[model samples]
Target: VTFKNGKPTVKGTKTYPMFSNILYRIADTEARRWAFYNDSKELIIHVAVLFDYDSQIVPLGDTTAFRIGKYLCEVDVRPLETQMFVEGSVTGWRVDTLEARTAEDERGYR
Candidate 1:
């Protein structure tokens, strides 16, 4: 779907992952993923940090990404299981890497 200045998304595939995409687009924030048990009582991982942002948005996968910018773009997971669910439009300097993410040694990284 397309983005509007002060209006909500008018058209787009509304999948579970798409929820984050719509959220980031509207609020410029991350979409909180739902966590609950299924009827089978299986702890379905419907949400979690799949990985660090690569700043790429391609048909197959993101090829490039920015670590620092006026828009703090970061990709989590998205609808259709894509990485389209991302943040935007901000100012800051932070480290977002795959190994650093898992290590959790950095004080202000996560």
Candidate 2:
């Protein structure tokens, strides 16, 4: 199913019947590690790195599902670390969900 602006917008309870389940898997192991931060310096240097990493994974997972099947899918990242920022630096980083996709339907035609 296609959305008005290429985005899924539906009301509560009722769901679009285009997607069944979206399986998200990272292609590159290095890319998967992009969200990993060892020290505070890494976090501070790459504050938005998590977001960027997630952005990369989101499309990868979504497109994977798109290729296998069709659905209205969306991805969201949940933060593992409560304190994302520290005093002028980031102490740690967490990858809430490496990949997550939501679809209305449970199966695909193709």
Any runs in candidate 2 off by more than 4 Å, and if so which? 1-90, 108-110
What is the C-alpha local distance difference test score of each model?
Answer: 0.27, 0.22
Candidate 1 local lDDT, 1-110, one digit each (tens): 33322222222223221232332222222432221111111111122222334333221123234333222333333222223333333332243322111212347432
lDDT computed for candidate 2: 0.22
Write one digit per residue (lDDT tens) for candidate 2, span 16-110. 22112221121223223212111111111111222221222232221211211222122332221111111112223333323322322358321
**lDDT for 42 (candidate 1):** 15
* Lowest-sum lDDT 10-residue window in model 1: 35-44
Pairs in clash, predicted candidate 1: 17-78, 17-79, 18-79, 55-64, 55-65, 56-62
Q: Considering every candidate listed, which one attains the maximal TM-score?
A: 1
Top lDDT hit:
1
lDDT of 2 at 14: 26
